[PDB]
From Swiss-Prot:
Name of the protein in question: Androgen receptor
Domain NR LBD: 1-231
Site (Interaction with coactivator FXXLF and FXXFY motifs): 229
UniProt binding sites for 17beta-hydroxy-5alpha-androstan-3-one: 37, 84, 209
Effect of residue 247 to F: Decrease in CSK-induced phosphorylation
Effect of residue 82 to S: In prostate cancer
């Protein structure tokens, strides 16, 4: 029951990343979405660096390393975002960045109102569930290993070993605080269900961004190339079902 794994996750947790949005200019659909894309791009860099420092991660095949990242990035972003929205604005608003927060007016002006409401649900679960900052970190890590191609990775064996241990860490951080037996058996059920909620949501964001990408040109929203590239190559595989989420309760 020693904190070594937790020290690592807290040690690697990324810092405050600013979107670089002009909060002194009147709201707009394209200015809100272009900023979200620039924010996406910069948070990807962090995710890249955050992931490569994970216990066991660097033993995975290079492409597999690069793959689970691209496939799971949206869900990590949504999940982290929902956490910031819980600890910073008590879930009523979406804390994408300190300088890019969505009040209800923006959720609508940006035209992601329905997805926004879905993400706000998520941010609200943290509250109703009483997620400890430790359960959070463990879950955010596990998410990375939550979405894989339908055959497998070019060495599925290790991924599956990595995935199994992270589950154990999550199990550890539950049994290493309060009650036992029925209390933590159900506390585990609850979190895995919570983990599962991220996928549908991430799915929706995937659909939207892809659509936003093909429309981009004629609707003046800008996409940073690294991201534009991931949306156009890796995202289609998810929307088409060639890469699928791994649920706990399927
Ligand atoms: C606007 C859009 O293209 C569609 C959905 C958007 C996603 C929604 C989820 C999200 C959460 C964050 O905390 C980082 C920014 C972020 C996004 C940035 C750009 C995207 C991909």
């Amino acid at each position: 029951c020693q904190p070594i794994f937790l020290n690592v996750l807290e040690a690697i947790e990324p810092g405050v990343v600013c979107a670089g949005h002009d909060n002194n200019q009147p709201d707009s659909f394209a200015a809100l979405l272009s900023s979200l894309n620039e924010l996406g791009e910069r948070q990807l860099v962090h995710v890249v660096k955050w992931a490569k420092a994970l216990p066991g991660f660097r033993n995975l095949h290079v492409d597999d390393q690069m793959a689970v990242i691209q496939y799971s990035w949206m869900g990590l972003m949504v999940f982290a975002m929902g956490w910031r929205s819980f600890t910073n604005v008590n879930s009523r608003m979406l804390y994408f960045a300190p300088d890019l927060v969505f009040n209800e007016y923006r959720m609508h002006k940006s035209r992601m109102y329905s997805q926004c409401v879905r993400m706000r649900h998520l941010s609200q679960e943290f509250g109703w569930l009483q997620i400890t900052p430790q359960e959070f970190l463990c879950m955010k890590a596990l998410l990375l290993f939550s979405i894989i191609p339908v055959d497998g990775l070019k060495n599925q064996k290790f991924f599956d070993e990595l995935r199994m241990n992270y589950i154990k860490e999550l199990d550890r951080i539950i049994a290493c605080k309060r009650k036992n037996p029925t209390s933590c058996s159900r506390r585990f059920y609850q979190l895995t269900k919570l983990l599962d909620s991220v996928q549908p949501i991430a799915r929706e964001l995937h659909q939207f961004t892809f659509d936003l990408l093909i429309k981009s040109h004629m609707v003046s929203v800008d996409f940073p190339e690294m991201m534009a590239e991931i949306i156009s190559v890796q995202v289609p595989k998810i929307l088409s079902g060639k890469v699928k989420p791994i649920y706990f309760h399927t």
